[PDB]
Amino acid sequence: GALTESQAALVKSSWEEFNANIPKHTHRFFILVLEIAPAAKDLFSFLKGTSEVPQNNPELQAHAGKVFKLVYEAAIQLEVTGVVVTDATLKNLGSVHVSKGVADAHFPVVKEAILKTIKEVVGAKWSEELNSAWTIAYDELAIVIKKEMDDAA
Numbered sequence: 456g457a458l459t460e461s462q463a464a465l466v467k468s469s470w471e472e473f474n475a476n477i478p479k480h481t482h483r484f485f486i487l488v489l490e491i492a493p494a495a496k497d498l499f500s501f502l503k504g505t506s507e508v509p510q511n512n513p514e515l516q517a518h519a520g521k522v523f524k525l526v527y528e529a530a531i532q533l534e535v536t537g538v539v540v541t542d543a544t545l546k547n548l549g550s551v552h553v554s555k556g557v558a559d560a561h562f563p564v565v566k567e568a569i570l571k572t573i574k575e576v577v578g579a580k581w582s583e584e585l586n587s588a589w590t591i592a593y594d595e596l597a598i599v600i601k602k603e604m605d606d607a608a
């Protein structure tokens with residue numbers, strides 16, 4: 456697809472729509488996670504010991520926000536520049552994943568959980584051209600973190 460001017464305009468537009476409601480989209484995101492894969496619950500300090508996904512836990516909100524930000528920034532950088540750039544932060548991300556017991560097979564879990572979350576966020580504006588654009592940008596960003604975990608292992 457590439458990332459045409461017209462595609463990037465479509466991710467930016469759809470991210471601004473996500474951030475517009477963090478405590479919803481983020482608790483949704485964690486439920487789509489636990490639907491796709493229930494065991495994933497023991498991983499999260501803030502979910503351990505609990506029985507249901509807390510809805511106002513700051514630890515959880517802060518966590519999930521940071522995750523979508525990072526995917527959007529990735530799409531812009533792909534249309535301007537043509538790439539996703541690996542920095543200190545992605546590197547540290549890879550460390551903390553490993554300490555907590557996270558593996559690669561866990562990633563399509565969190566992708567489908569983000570596509571399905573953005574398809575839920577944009578609703579009728581949804582196009583092929585836009586699904587194509589978020590897929591490209593997640594795939595391109597996961598390639599980069601998985602890279603850094605393998606390296607923290």
Ligand code: HEM
Pocket residue numbers: 495498499500501517518521522523525526548551552555557558561562563564565593596597600
């Ligand atoms: C491109 C995709 C991904 C991005 C951008 C991302 C981003 C992040 C960030 C930024 C943190 C640190 C949050 C903090 O310091 O507050 C974190 C922690 C963590 N992540 Fe991910 N992540 C991704 C995929 C995954 C996957 C597939 C899993 C496995 C289900 C996972 C499991 C965890 C766990 C257990 C923690 C530790 C949280 C703790 O116990 O408090 N992440 N992630």
